[PDB]
Amino acid sequence: SVTVYAAASLTNAINDLEKIYEKQNKVEVKTSYAGSSTLAKQIEAGAPADIFISADTQWMDYLQNKKLVAANDRINLLGNRLVLITPKGQSLNIKLDKATDPNKVFTGKICTGDTKSVPVGKYAKQAFTNLGWWNRIEPKLVETEDVRVALNFVARGECQVGIVYATDAAISKDVKVAGIFPENTHSPIIYPLGLIKKNSNSAKFYQFLQSNQAKAVFKKYGFSMLA
Template sequence: MKVLVIRKDLQDIPFRKMALLTGVLVVALIARPVAADPILVFAASSLSGALDAVAEDYQKTHPTNIKISYAASSTLARQLAQGAPADIYISANLVWVRYVEDQQAIQAASKFILVRNQLVLAAPGQAGAAPIRLSAAFFEKHLKAGRLVLADPTHVPAGIYAREALKNMNLWHVVQHRLALGINVRAALSLLERREAPLGILYKTDVLTNPHTKIVSTFPPSSHAPIEYTAALAIGRTGKEVLKFFQYLQSPVAEARLSQFGFDPV
């Protein structure tokens, strides 16, 4: 049971003044700012770390709580289409952007390209060796006793780009039966980092920010579709704080911060 204790000095205040004082207190309580709901961002797993830094920078000058959920763009797209309460969706592949657009899960007019990336062949170890020429002979030699790590090419953007590049370079038939698949690009990176495979096809940014992996070669941009990260507002998300952060993502400041992690500006 709660007990109301009235201080002795307040007992001497006339009733009308007490009522006025109470009214002022109530107004003050009502006027106190109420913490806004967190901004929930669904983002491709390859943005992990870089997008965290952008969000942290933003929160230094804006009293907003930003939560970021990372996974394969395909996984997040399906969740969003099923009604997951995200405010912003950032995909590493245009196919999944079109999917959520067809499902009427995003505001189509809000779409913009956040940053770009590159596709590389990577290996465990530290950088230093000269880039090699991608060829059937190279893969046959280095995959005799090991596998090539990819993100799952049936739905994960990094794997889709890798398969496309290998097919266009007439190399898919050489490696397709020697694959080790990750559920997303960061899972694929982990396999390579633990030396469970001698080679992997990943994003440039994943390799540059990992001290245990190195770039062996870069795939020609013409061998695959452009690797562009598209951001969009989820359907019905028009809150002031959400819009302010979404606009910040389009700023030169955010672009410069992402570039520090190896992403290419638009």
């Protein structure tokens, strides 16, 4: 068997690829989804993940610095974009630009990942700082431990606005995009793929995730394939 720990934004894509791989191989694929921070810390504490897919470079670097992944056993796999979402039926259009006043357009809470640790929240905080919004945004935050928890708060109408990835907005019929953050407001959203345990089965699944067959699944969900 192969155990794959993956950022919560990858839940649907990796579940699809797990099913495909299991049909094509006599191998059991075990999956665990959470915030990239939680997953990396668990691996550090000895969790038996063979493969880790982070929603940012930082949490893979975190493991590399602790010698848990080698520089030659990781590759930048996927890209994404950062978006504002609202519940269906409370649509907005907000320009993510310095000229916009967050106190005028955000009149409730803003739900996203913890801005210190969860990739989606770290990207969001970079963007708020770049836009000059941080000290007006921070008092409105409801912070979660992965991007899908935040997506569901907005889908249930429990928060007026959320910040999630473009792929998360696409998966939920219950939320709509209220604005796309320009790429120049934050570091590029990059998903590194890391081979943590080097064995025959794990190396095969690591290559499979880079295959022409996997590219079709990721693109279907709205991820970009990195060069």
